[PDB]
Design a protein around this ligand. Structure first.
Ligand SMILES: Nc1nc2c(ncn2[C@@H]2O[C@H](COP(=O)(O)OP(=O)(O)NP(=O)(O)O)[C@@H](O)[C@H]2O)c(=O)[nH]1
Ligand SMILES: [Mg+2]
Lengths: 207, 172
């Protein structure tokens, strides 16, 4: 059971990709355009992550699936990390949505005016108990190069008492929460046995 | 600038060729690199029948059982189904009855269905005969095609027959 090796490698890959991404965060060119595209940031992060994992030889236990445009719209997720056990079964899926904090076009009129937060919630509900929603925030007000993480269930616990819509509630969570947990410990807790779902509590994920 | 919009879903076991089938119909191309579909996806394509402009919203579903709940959640509003098995895979053909009951369960209102046995280019690896497939189609009341997404055999025919029988219904 090689849980520790993949846990360590994936957490270090996340940290490494975040470090590589920090170079591009905060770029603003007033004479033309004041932001890199969200897809561009996602792709830079994913490229560095995937290359790190490939060099560490964990491709048999982790698969990264980048959502298409249609899939990102429908699911509210920008990518998905699938963890495989030695029995070649899926142990855990992380559906990841990225935010900044400083659309469909091929669909006729339906009830798809739902927010990204709620679509991610519905996606994780439909996949099942071993699928976790995760938000990664690229940049904070006053800290453009700060990268932070939040588990969906923690945001749910916060909105129980705070009564805000999901999207704003994530921002208020990363702005009001000072307790944190490092990505490595989270990764361990969700893989040895699927516990992190209703476990993380009132912390953010420090990258 | 369309007269009708038809929602079609491609369903069936993993590896039977569903994504390849859609890719061939919509982009006139084929790839041997098997990449399993996560959840569901869709493409769109415009066709013309009797001067009518029809937008097809073709949904490609995931065959793995882990994605059953999500895929069945997208059956709602379906006007057409392509139920795919792989003529070289006995398991995929045995599962056809279950797929049919799922269509009837999550799409109670009458949606037209085409039964498709894919990979007919693989004659040396055939385990399901053509007559077995058409007899199953007759049993379930479905039209039947044998197809190859790789060699582009009966792909356009499948989709156009689906459009035909959807247009024959609703004409009352
Ligand atoms: N010989 C042959 N191979 C085919 C044909 N269609 C697909 N394949 C091959 O079969 C494999 C699976 O194709 P794919 O379209 O991904 O099947 P799928 O139904 O979408 N799988 P999933 O449900 O997991 O998403 C690929 O290696 C593909 O090249 C065909 O008509 N002939
Ligand atoms: Mg597929």
């Amino acid at each position: 059971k090689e849980v520790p090796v993949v846990c360590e490698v994936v957490s270090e890959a996340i940290v490494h990709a975040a470090q590589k991404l920090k170079e591009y965060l905060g770029f603003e060119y007033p004479p033309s355009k004041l932001c890199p595209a969200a897809n561009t940031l996602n792709e830079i992060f994913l490229i560095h992550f995937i290359t790190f994992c490939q060099e560490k030889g964990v491709d048999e236990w982790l698969t990264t699936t980048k959502m298409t445009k249609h899939q990102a719209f429908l699911f509210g997720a920008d990518w998905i990390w699938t963890f495989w056990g030695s029995d070649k079964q899926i142990k855990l899926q992380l559906a990841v949505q990225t935010l900044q904090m400083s659309p469909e076009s091929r669909v006729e009129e339906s009830s798809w005016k739902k927010s990204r937060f709620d679509k991610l919630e519905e996606f994780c509900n439909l996949i099942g108990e071993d699928c976790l929603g995760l938000f990664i925030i690229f940049g904070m007000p006053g800290k453009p190069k700060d990268i932070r993480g939040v588990v969906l269930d923690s945001v749910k616990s916060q909105m129980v008492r705070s009564h805000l819509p999901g999207g704003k509630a994530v921002a208020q969570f990363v702005l009001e929460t000072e307790d944190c947990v490092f990505i490595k410990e989270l990764l361990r807790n969700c893989l040895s046995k699927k516990d992190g779902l209703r476990e993380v509590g009132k912390v953010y994920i420090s990258i | 600038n369309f007269d009708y919009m038809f929602k079609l879903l491609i369903i069936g076991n993993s590896s039977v060729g569903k994504t390849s089938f859609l890719f061939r119909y919509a982009d006139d191309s084929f790839t041997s690199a098997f990449v399993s579909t996560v959840g569901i996806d869709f493409k769109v394509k415009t066709v013309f029948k009797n001067e009518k402009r029809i937008k097809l919203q073709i949904w490609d579903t995931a065959g793995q059982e882990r994605y059953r709940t999500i895929t069945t959640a997208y059956y709602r509003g379906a006007m057409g189904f392509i139920l795919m098995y792989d003529i070289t895979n006995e398991e995929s053909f045995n599962a056809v009855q279950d797929w049919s009951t799922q269509i009837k369960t999550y799409s109670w209102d009458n949606a037209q269905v085409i039964l498709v046995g894919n990979k007919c280019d693989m004659e040396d690896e055939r385990v399901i005969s053509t007559e077995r497939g058409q007899h199953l189609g007759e049993q379930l009341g479905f039209e039947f095609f044998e197809t190859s997404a790789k060699d582009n055999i009966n792909v356009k025919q499948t989709f156009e027959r689906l459009v035909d029988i959807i247009c024959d219904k609703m004409s009352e």
